[PDB]
């Protein structure tokens, strides 16, 4: 919930991938 | 839309590069155009010189 | 065709469309009481119906008719907007665009309707004229020159405290600048728009990015405003003469570009700042040696560039500009003869630190050369340091610059050769240095302490 | 958070990434107008000196 | 877990995870020298312009300390 909100609020449309 | 959108943002990064690369290759074409239309301006300037030589 | 694709999806332009569309002006009534004829009103109505749905440029001529004949700003803005909407869309109004373009007459007629009433009016019209000029099937310099000379379009452009006005205006100018021929006429009217373009850029530097304002920050609206201004600039500067002329007039404002690069992360703002400098530093440009000195010295260009080289930006092109600019500034100063530079500064009496003027090597080579009457040139320098302090006082801007430089030069020479010690004593410079410790400003007492320590070391070990 | 909030964040982002590339693309071919005159002008001049 | 951080958002994600190199070894040594002289008597640009005022002040402090102890030695060479 913190990594998802932070990469979207700054623009820069290349999302991260968080696997387990 | 979380797991659809990430795939969409992934696609935009490849398309982003591609727009830039297509403009970087357009540029390269412009350079050849400069050498082509200049090659033509010299032999049209030759006959310009041959025109005022056959007049003299 | 769909003419120009800019100013259709643009946000400031959309804000202006809301005001026009909000309002509903009935043609039918105006036409009936007379201000226009039934045929012009029938066409205008039918025109709305084409745009919203389905399948003319045949419709073009009565709208041109209406615009001219009426004086009423509200109907004319609604007619002009509808014409703009079609012109840009390739889903609605491909045929429209062709109709201007074939016959130059309806463009000159469209130019007529420019410079009329409200500020919104002048934008819309200006947008349509500019769309046909940049299509390569027609061009006229006179339109662009003429539109530039006027009061109303430049007044709208001058204001920057309404985002909408500036945004459109800088874009109209700049779009036209892409085509090589306009660059020459646009430059004639420069002195009017150009300080304002600089004001937006400066304004961005002062307001912190750590916040968000909605006027110009790190958000999309601001990013475009900066970009547009820099792009308009870059375009004129491509011509070799213009670029030399830009540096000499706009010098203060020009130096500010370095600053933009630093505060932004935006690869749009930064690439262009560095690039515009690179063009002016070029070999092609007349008097490039002068501009390079001015930039490096005053604007701190060399130190700023060197720092940049470590912290490069993702895009390659940005990197290329940082590297190429870095090389010219540095190369240029060192590659001039050491003896030349030293003699040139001392004689004219104007002294400033420079890349090879502070190097240990510069002095090492030049010591021997000085000798002509027991190091006559060095002696003249000590004489200059002595002169400045006594005459005209000290802590006056000019005289203070020279002292720090004169004192840097004398330390290196003295530390190098032990015979210099006699020269300080004979001339009487040795005493002058003791006073300089006492004379105000940190750089002055700093330089005096270094000047003293070099002398002491040879007298008493 | 919610599917609406991420969607909004999505339209703004792919817009910035894409717009920025298109604006950079313009800058590359703005520079190509400068190099077209410059090489063409050099190349022509060198030969026209020899032609004269 | 396994993350995948792109190069566009890399410093921001790393500084986020922090709240949830020979260069800065050298600058650590210079800050240590500034800490010894007193005892003896963020974005990438915002770090890049403050490392400049670390270096530009370390240089003048080192040369002014080395022009002070070597002058104290010359003072004691005359007092002896």
XYZ file of C-alpha atoms in Angstrom:
669
model
C 0.000 0.000 0.000
C 2.950 2.378 0.424
C 4.930 1.330 -2.658
C 1.789 1.401 -4.806
C 0.721 4.901 -3.756
C 4.218 6.362 -4.032
C 5.094 5.301 -7.583
C 1.772 6.654 -8.865
C 1.819 10.024 -7.094
C 5.083 11.143 -8.730
C 4.170 10.260 -12.320
C 6.971 8.364 -14.114
C 4.760 5.671 -15.605
C 6.901 2.558 -15.120
C 5.431 0.531 -12.270
C 7.383 -1.715 -9.918
C 6.831 -5.457 -9.488
C 6.454 -6.813 -5.945
C 6.577 -10.619 -5.789
C 6.625 -13.001 -2.817
C -7.353 -2.431 -12.648
C -4.138 -2.927 -10.595
C -2.861 -5.972 -12.546
C -4.028 -4.643 -15.926
C -2.613 -1.254 -15.559
C 0.956 -2.331 -14.592
C 1.062 -4.208 -18.003
C -0.103 -0.978 -19.678
C 2.609 1.142 -17.964
C 5.114 -1.573 -18.992
C 3.939 -1.121 -22.631
C 4.236 2.721 -22.491
C 7.961 2.426 -21.512
C 8.710 0.360 -24.667
C 6.518 2.855 -26.798
C 8.250 5.794 -25.142
C 11.676 4.540 -26.312
C 10.267 3.752 -29.676
C 8.906 7.345 -30.339
C 12.254 8.682 -29.365
C 14.203 6.144 -31.504
C 11.889 6.808 -34.491
C 12.679 10.643 -34.174
C 16.481 9.793 -33.661
C 16.238 7.709 -37.021
C 14.201 10.573 -38.720
C 17.108 12.807 -37.812
C 19.527 10.412 -39.554
C 17.394 10.492 -42.676
C 17.565 14.316 -42.574
C 21.347 14.006 -42.738
C 21.257 11.985 -45.916
C 18.757 14.460 -47.423
C 21.324 17.209 -46.878
C 24.012 15.257 -48.907
C 21.478 14.278 -51.659
C 19.903 17.730 -52.349
C 23.445 19.268 -52.190
C 24.830 16.817 -54.701
C 22.064 18.200 -56.934
C 22.774 21.822 -56.191
C 26.399 21.469 -57.309
C 25.718 19.993 -60.812
C 22.937 22.596 -61.361
C 25.559 25.250 -60.470
C 27.936 23.560 -62.964
C 25.519 24.277 -65.882
C 24.963 27.675 -64.421
C 28.663 28.268 -64.986
C 28.486 26.481 -68.411
C 25.544 28.775 -69.463
C 27.486 32.058 -68.853
C 30.634 30.405 -70.441
C 28.796 29.607 -73.756
C 27.343 33.163 -73.601
C 30.886 34.679 -73.351
C -5.660 16.459 -42.764
C -6.599 17.695 -39.324
C -4.137 20.509 -39.629
C -2.174 21.229 -36.487
C -2.709 18.705 -33.646
C -1.469 20.977 -30.962
C -4.017 23.265 -29.236
C -6.815 20.798 -29.225
C -6.070 18.664 -26.206
C -4.034 21.426 -24.578
C -5.272 22.356 -21.127
C -5.071 26.100 -21.155
C -6.802 26.054 -24.558
C -9.576 23.793 -23.138
C -10.151 26.362 -20.324
C -10.576 28.998 -22.990
C -13.103 26.738 -25.009
C -15.305 26.329 -21.932
C -16.046 30.055 -21.713
C -16.981 30.294 -25.421
C -19.100 27.081 -25.472
C -20.821 27.943 -22.188
C -22.365 30.866 -23.949
C -24.939 30.317 -26.590
C -25.454 33.000 -29.183
C -28.388 32.694 -31.486
C -27.432 33.587 -35.090
C -31.049 33.265 -36.305
C -32.146 36.325 -34.270
C -29.110 38.466 -35.130
C -29.528 37.574 -38.809
C -33.333 38.396 -38.744
C -32.811 41.858 -37.109
C -29.903 42.226 -39.572
C -26.195 41.942 -38.854
C -25.903 38.997 -41.193
C -28.145 37.219 -43.718
C -30.177 33.947 -43.377
C -27.706 31.995 -45.544
C -24.723 32.772 -43.103
C -26.896 31.747 -40.036
C -28.187 28.386 -41.806
C -24.590 27.498 -42.516
C -23.376 28.227 -39.039
C -26.153 26.069 -37.520
C -25.610 23.190 -39.917
C -21.895 23.441 -39.022
C -22.533 22.542 -35.354
C -24.483 19.457 -36.552
C -21.532 18.145 -38.666
C -19.013 18.368 -35.795
C -21.040 16.434 -33.294
C -21.846 13.591 -35.647
C -21.396 12.229 -39.167
C -20.139 13.734 -42.507
C -17.948 19.874 -45.536
C -15.558 22.665 -46.428
C -18.380 23.963 -48.645
C -19.774 25.491 -45.473
C -16.440 27.410 -45.049
C -17.286 30.431 -47.222
C -20.499 31.690 -45.467
C -18.722 31.366 -42.021
C -15.833 33.518 -43.497
C -18.611 35.899 -44.640
C -20.205 36.082 -41.169
C -16.964 36.770 -39.383
C -16.097 39.772 -41.399
C -19.510 41.421 -41.826
C -20.581 41.165 -38.066
C -18.732 43.184 -35.405
C -20.213 41.309 -32.465
C -17.524 39.475 -30.484
C -19.828 36.778 -29.018
C -21.137 35.384 -32.257
C -17.639 35.640 -33.925
C -15.922 33.816 -31.090
C -18.507 30.943 -31.405
C -18.110 30.857 -35.210
C -14.207 30.974 -34.882
C -14.134 28.288 -32.181
C -16.271 25.921 -34.340
C -13.776 26.513 -37.237
C -10.835 25.703 -34.904
C -12.511 22.497 -33.677
C -12.812 21.156 -37.259
C -9.447 22.352 -38.429
C -7.515 20.169 -35.918
C -9.771 17.090 -36.069
C -9.172 14.385 -38.812
C -12.375 12.701 -37.719
C -14.322 15.928 -38.134
C -13.400 18.518 -40.715
C -10.637 16.989 -43.063
C -12.450 18.777 -46.058
C -12.583 22.059 -44.141
C -8.715 22.342 -44.021
C -8.199 21.792 -47.785
C -10.517 24.783 -48.535
C -8.337 27.357 -46.834
C -5.235 25.888 -48.121
C -6.155 25.860 -51.941
C -7.135 29.480 -51.957
C -4.957 31.915 -49.863
C -7.763 34.479 -49.887
C -9.813 32.948 -47.081
C -6.652 32.929 -44.916
C -6.073 36.706 -45.495
C -9.840 37.078 -44.714
C -9.354 34.969 -41.465
C -6.390 37.285 -40.575
C -8.821 40.226 -40.821
C -10.934 38.944 -37.986
C -7.692 38.902 -35.831
C -7.204 41.939 -33.503
C -10.798 42.344 -32.464
C -12.538 42.890 -29.040
C -11.861 40.361 -26.201
C -8.498 38.577 -25.605
C -10.050 35.153 -26.163
C -10.928 36.352 -29.723
C -7.390 37.154 -30.723
C -6.190 33.683 -29.504
C -8.617 31.626 -31.498
C -8.150 33.433 -34.745
C -4.322 33.423 -34.203
C -4.420 29.544 -33.695
C -6.339 29.042 -37.039
C -3.983 31.364 -39.128
C -0.929 29.729 -37.583
C -2.253 26.159 -38.447
C -2.415 26.961 -42.260
C 1.010 28.778 -42.336
C 2.865 25.789 -40.958
C 1.229 23.421 -43.553
C 3.823 23.667 -46.306
C 1.340 24.424 -49.144
C 1.283 28.079 -48.109
C 3.527 30.543 -46.283
C 3.550 34.317 -45.962
C 6.117 36.165 -43.974
C 4.086 39.454 -44.037
C 1.310 37.876 -41.936
C 3.659 36.762 -39.282
C 5.676 40.030 -39.319
C 2.477 42.120 -39.262
C 0.809 40.158 -36.472
C 4.040 40.632 -34.443
C 4.098 44.485 -34.814
C 0.622 44.874 -33.395
C -0.351 45.969 -29.877
C -3.124 43.479 -28.878
C -1.389 40.096 -29.554
C 1.852 41.220 -27.815
C -0.185 42.646 -24.795
C -1.831 39.211 -24.186
C 1.606 37.548 -24.487
C 3.251 40.060 -22.042
C 0.728 39.022 -19.257
C 1.891 35.834 -17.461
C -0.410 36.036 -14.416
C -3.053 34.278 -16.482
C -1.513 30.902 -17.468
C -4.027 30.601 -20.449
C -2.926 33.726 -22.206
C 0.820 33.117 -22.210
C 0.610 29.437 -22.904
C -1.278 29.908 -26.258
C 0.784 32.943 -27.419
C 4.245 31.459 -26.920
C 3.098 28.346 -28.779
C 1.653 30.279 -31.791
C 5.119 32.135 -32.156
C 7.215 29.069 -31.584
C 5.271 26.771 -34.011
C 5.852 29.211 -36.758
C 9.621 29.419 -35.730
C 10.090 25.712 -36.750
C 10.039 26.773 -40.344
C 13.368 28.421 -41.095
C 12.046 31.729 -42.907
C 10.054 33.121 -39.904
C 13.090 32.958 -37.580
C 14.479 36.085 -39.312
C 11.168 38.091 -39.014
C 10.353 36.812 -35.469
C 13.871 38.074 -34.297
C 12.903 41.701 -35.394
C 10.113 41.864 -32.889
C 12.261 39.951 -30.236
C 12.801 42.821 -27.880
C 9.138 42.860 -26.991
C 8.339 39.176 -26.180
C 11.888 38.082 -25.001
C 12.105 39.668 -21.551
C 8.707 38.099 -20.671
C 9.937 34.624 -21.900
C 12.898 35.145 -19.561
C 10.556 36.197 -16.681
C 8.651 32.874 -16.781
C 11.925 30.948 -16.584
C 13.361 32.997 -13.653
C 9.979 32.793 -11.925
C 10.253 28.978 -11.922
C 13.788 29.048 -10.444
C 12.636 31.145 -7.394
C 9.576 29.201 -6.412
C 10.395 26.007 -4.639
C 9.538 22.562 -6.336
C 9.218 21.174 -2.775
C 5.777 22.576 -2.692
C 3.006 22.360 -5.281
C 1.333 25.399 -6.582
C -0.918 25.042 -9.507
C 0.555 27.976 -11.388
C 4.014 26.483 -12.394
C 5.746 23.835 -10.310
C 6.647 20.242 -11.237
C 3.085 19.669 -12.619
C 2.296 19.313 -16.259
C 1.151 23.000 -16.836
C 4.435 24.507 -15.589
C 6.583 22.019 -17.283
C 5.084 23.020 -20.633
C 5.354 26.818 -19.957
C 9.130 26.566 -19.297
C 9.634 24.240 -22.290
C 7.814 26.483 -24.742
C 9.856 29.524 -23.744
C 13.153 27.701 -24.105
C 12.100 26.084 -27.426
C 11.180 29.549 -28.927
C 14.666 30.714 -27.863
C 16.550 27.664 -29.201
C 15.063 28.061 -32.592
C 16.204 31.647 -33.276
C 19.719 30.798 -31.834
C 20.282 28.111 -34.539
C 21.285 30.910 -37.029
C 25.043 31.753 -36.425
C 24.791 35.567 -36.231
C 21.656 35.640 -34.025
C 23.287 33.568 -31.350
C 26.312 35.959 -31.014
C 23.796 38.908 -30.836
C 21.676 36.988 -28.136
C 24.621 36.662 -25.655
C 25.633 40.382 -25.971
C 22.101 41.739 -25.416
C 20.545 39.278 -23.030
C 23.549 38.405 -20.919
C 22.097 38.689 -17.471
C 18.924 36.702 -18.336
C 20.947 34.099 -20.371
C 23.135 33.135 -17.369
C 19.989 32.016 -15.490
C 19.693 28.906 -17.812
C 22.396 27.046 -15.665
C 20.126 27.447 -12.706
C 17.109 25.890 -14.390
C 19.116 22.682 -15.177
C 20.061 22.408 -11.521
C 16.613 22.796 -9.838
C 14.743 20.625 -12.382
C 14.776 16.797 -12.868
C 12.601 17.473 -16.076
C 14.472 16.255 -19.069
C 12.603 18.778 -21.265
C 13.557 21.896 -19.416
C 17.234 20.860 -18.756
C 18.319 19.479 -22.194
C 17.139 22.624 -23.832
C 18.967 24.972 -21.334
C 22.327 23.228 -21.924
C 21.709 22.951 -25.648
C 20.942 26.756 -26.087
C 24.331 27.464 -24.354
C 26.137 24.860 -26.540
C 24.844 26.562 -29.687
C 26.260 30.016 -28.627
C 29.663 28.409 -27.590
C 30.022 26.897 -31.044
C 32.830 27.380 -33.453
C 30.426 28.520 -36.145
C 29.197 31.501 -34.139
C 31.121 34.785 -34.561
C 33.196 35.902 -31.509
C 32.903 32.626 -29.715
C 36.039 33.198 -27.710
C 34.434 36.222 -26.042
C 31.112 34.587 -25.157
C 33.008 31.547 -23.653
C 35.071 33.791 -21.260
C 31.945 35.701 -20.192
C 29.990 32.475 -19.486
C 32.751 30.631 -17.689
C 33.837 33.623 -15.506
C 30.632 35.410 -14.442
C 28.073 32.678 -14.694
C 30.380 30.012 -13.094
C 29.643 27.858 -16.127
C 32.787 25.605 -15.856
C 32.310 24.620 -12.156
C 28.515 24.146 -12.696
C 29.149 21.819 -15.802
C 31.766 19.756 -14.022
C 29.428 19.063 -11.107
C 26.697 18.120 -13.771
C 28.889 15.552 -15.441
C 28.708 13.259 -12.410
C 24.912 13.568 -12.066
C 23.732 12.840 -15.642
C 20.160 12.321 -16.809
C 18.752 9.222 -18.184
C 18.366 10.388 -21.849
C 21.547 10.027 -23.968
C 21.185 13.237 -25.865
C 21.246 15.188 -22.563
C 24.546 13.484 -21.720
C 26.068 14.485 -25.134
C 25.225 18.147 -24.603
C 26.715 18.125 -21.030
C 30.029 16.535 -22.420
C 30.376 18.664 -25.616
C 29.773 22.027 -23.654
C 32.198 21.027 -20.880
C 35.063 20.534 -23.461
C 34.842 23.917 -25.297
C 34.831 26.101 -22.088
C 37.793 24.260 -20.443
C 39.832 23.808 -23.713
C 39.600 27.379 -24.746
C 41.107 29.107 -21.703
C 44.124 26.786 -21.002
C 45.089 26.464 -24.848
C 46.008 30.276 -25.001
C 49.708 31.102 -24.148
C 50.537 31.740 -20.481
C 52.741 34.714 -21.042
C 50.076 36.406 -23.256
C 47.283 36.134 -20.676
C 49.390 37.524 -17.783
C 50.716 40.538 -19.734
C 47.236 41.288 -21.171
C 45.532 41.446 -17.685
C 48.280 43.480 -15.974
C 48.436 46.091 -18.712
C 44.784 46.826 -19.118
C 44.590 46.911 -15.308
C 41.532 44.479 -15.247
C 42.302 41.210 -13.361
C 40.245 38.114 -12.618
C 41.031 34.554 -11.693
C 40.727 32.043 -14.613
C 41.558 28.268 -15.140
C 45.133 28.570 -16.144
C 45.643 31.929 -14.371
C 45.524 30.159 -11.008
C 47.616 27.087 -12.015
C 51.161 26.566 -10.480
C 52.550 25.685 -13.947
C 51.545 29.094 -15.414
C 53.976 30.813 -13.119
C 56.689 28.230 -13.442
C 57.069 28.770 -17.159
C 56.591 32.536 -17.003
C 59.338 33.484 -14.318
C 62.322 33.545 -16.631
C 60.541 35.519 -19.287
C 59.841 38.361 -16.773
C 63.557 39.194 -16.499
C 64.594 42.241 -18.440
C 65.514 44.607 -15.690
C 65.514 42.297 -12.670
C 62.009 40.770 -13.078
C 60.545 44.041 -14.417
C 57.104 42.654 -15.269
C 56.689 41.100 -11.672
C 57.829 44.334 -10.228
C 55.094 46.235 -12.161
C 52.548 43.863 -10.644
C 53.736 44.581 -7.055
C 53.606 48.256 -8.039
C 49.863 47.765 -9.172
C 48.904 46.149 -5.771
C 50.578 49.015 -3.976
C 48.975 51.707 -6.109
C 45.303 50.445 -5.706
C 45.335 50.399 -1.917
C 46.701 53.993 -1.571
C 44.858 55.639 -4.497
C 41.107 55.765 -4.557
C 40.990 53.853 -1.102
C 39.897 50.219 -0.791
C 36.602 48.371 -0.539
C 35.262 49.932 -3.753
C 33.959 47.100 -6.021
C 36.536 47.384 -8.812
C 39.627 47.927 -6.818
C 38.759 45.056 -4.368
C 38.534 42.413 -7.277
C 42.085 43.222 -8.501
C 43.674 42.975 -4.923
C 42.647 39.328 -4.396
C 43.926 38.328 -7.847
C 47.145 40.413 -7.525
C 47.741 38.780 -4.179
C 47.095 35.168 -5.563
C 49.692 35.876 -8.406
C 52.363 37.204 -6.044
C 52.146 34.109 -3.644
C 52.768 31.628 -6.429
C 55.767 33.579 -7.937
C 57.390 34.123 -4.426
C 56.918 30.495 -3.279
C 58.565 29.449 -6.588
C 61.789 31.765 -6.640
C 63.708 33.007 -3.478
C 65.035 36.033 -5.401
C 61.647 37.549 -5.288
C 62.153 38.415 -1.686
C 64.537 41.329 -2.692
C 61.927 42.652 -5.075
C 59.217 42.951 -2.371
C 61.722 44.839 -0.138
C 63.110 47.216 -2.872
C 59.652 48.232 -4.269
C 58.186 48.286 -0.799
C 55.487 45.696 -1.364
C 56.480 43.693 1.730
C 54.947 46.441 4.028
C 51.770 46.808 1.920
C 50.985 43.064 2.466
C 51.088 43.558 6.417
C 48.338 46.259 5.975
C 46.269 43.984 3.785
C 45.797 41.483 6.712
C 44.017 44.437 8.495
C 42.033 45.501 5.441
C 38.478 44.151 5.439
C 36.796 41.187 3.701
C 37.525 37.512 4.274
C 39.104 36.807 0.696
C 41.392 39.880 1.128
C 42.806 38.863 4.669
C 42.926 35.248 3.412
C 45.033 36.202 0.395
C 47.273 38.511 2.539
C 48.044 35.710 5.047
C 49.030 33.374 2.152
C 51.052 36.315 0.607
C 52.843 36.809 3.985
C 53.564 33.065 4.743
C 55.321 32.572 1.292
C 57.638 35.587 2.070
C 58.466 34.558 5.630
C 59.622 31.011 4.648
C 62.552 32.132 2.651
C 63.735 34.919 5.126
C 63.839 32.611 8.244
C 63.459 28.783 7.893
C -5.862 2.455 -3.138
C -9.328 1.715 -4.504
C -9.753 0.737 -8.246
C -10.918 4.352 -9.029
C -7.899 6.008 -7.329
C -5.330 3.769 -9.099
C -7.172 4.402 -12.405
C -6.862 8.027 -12.028
C -3.199 7.663 -11.153
C -2.884 5.499 -14.227
C -4.277 8.057 -16.704
C -2.037 10.783 -15.460
C 1.098 8.645 -15.577
C 0.957 7.045 -19.016
C 0.033 10.499 -20.187
C 3.226 12.101 -18.783
C 5.544 9.212 -20.062
C 4.047 9.396 -23.551
C 3.746 13.187 -23.835
C 7.328 13.610 -22.624
C 8.644 11.229 -25.351
C 6.591 13.016 -28.084
C 7.962 16.484 -26.881
C 11.514 15.101 -26.878
C 10.889 13.722 -30.281
C 10.055 17.177 -31.488
C 13.276 18.525 -29.952
C 15.339 15.869 -31.941
C 13.825 16.852 -35.307
C 13.965 20.695 -34.361
C 17.686 19.983 -34.088
C 17.531 18.058 -37.497
C 16.245 21.295 -39.145
C 19.463 22.956 -37.817
C 21.793 20.133 -38.999
C 20.051 19.928 -42.462
C 20.970 23.598 -43.140
C 24.390 23.324 -41.640
C 25.723 20.157 -43.510
C 24.047 21.134 -46.712
C 25.543 24.614 -46.477
C 29.116 23.187 -45.742
C 29.113 20.561 -48.352
C 27.684 22.930 -51.053
C 30.154 25.718 -50.160
C 33.325 23.555 -50.261
C 32.432 22.392 -53.807
C 31.163 25.733 -55.123
C 34.574 27.322 -54.122
C 36.251 24.664 -56.282
C 33.603 25.183 -59.097
C 34.281 29.013 -59.110
C 9.783 -10.776 -1.080
C 11.298 -9.706 -4.416
C 11.058 -6.149 -5.725
C 11.818 -4.812 -9.192
C 12.833 -1.142 -9.131
C 13.163 0.650 -12.505
C 15.934 3.189 -13.129
C 13.525 6.126 -13.399
C 12.222 5.860 -9.817
C 15.250 4.246 -8.191
C 16.449 6.840 -5.660
C 12.869 7.595 -4.613
C 12.031 3.933 -3.924
C 15.317 3.468 -2.041
C 14.700 6.542 0.145
C 11.139 5.299 0.703
C 12.359 1.885 1.896
C 14.865 3.676 4.125
C 12.035 5.520 5.867
C 9.663 2.552 6.111
C 30.380 5.140 -3.054
C 34.084 6.003 -3.220
C 32.857 9.596 -3.672
C 30.966 9.578 -0.368
C 33.885 7.774 1.231
C 36.124 10.692 0.223
C 33.495 13.223 1.344
C 33.156 11.292 4.621
C 36.922 11.715 5.074
C 36.570 15.442 4.342
C 33.739 15.827 6.884
C 36.005 14.001 9.341
C 38.773 16.515 8.617
C 36.317 19.370 9.240
C 35.365 17.655 12.506
C 39.057 17.442 13.486
C 39.813 21.094 12.634
C 36.947 22.364 14.824
C 38.088 20.125 17.690
C 41.670 21.360 17.199
C 40.746 25.059 16.628
C 17.146 15.251 -0.747
C 17.246 15.346 -4.540
C 20.381 14.549 -6.528
C 21.003 18.208 -7.408
C 20.470 19.248 -3.776
C 23.220 16.801 -2.791
C 25.379 17.766 -5.788
C 25.455 21.463 -4.850
C 26.091 20.837 -1.136
C 28.976 18.449 -1.772
C 30.396 21.415 -3.730
C 30.311 23.614 -0.623
C 31.778 20.768 1.412
C 34.750 20.513 -0.983
C 35.157 24.273 -1.585
C 35.317 24.857 2.179
C 37.494 21.824 2.986
C 40.074 23.124 0.489
C 40.307 26.588 2.053
C 40.235 25.189 5.606
C 43.039 22.728 4.820
C 45.228 25.350 3.148
C 44.599 27.848 5.961
C 45.428 25.231 8.622
C 48.565 24.171 6.725
C 49.546 27.844 6.414
C 49.056 28.133 10.198
C 50.856 25.153 11.737
C 53.847 25.592 9.385
C 53.856 29.247 10.510
C 53.650 28.325 14.204
C 56.715 26.146 13.583
C 58.508 29.137 12.029
C 57.482 31.180 15.090
C 58.966 28.588 17.450
C 62.134 28.446 15.317
C 62.678 32.126 16.210
C 61.572 31.827 19.840
C 64.159 29.054 20.221
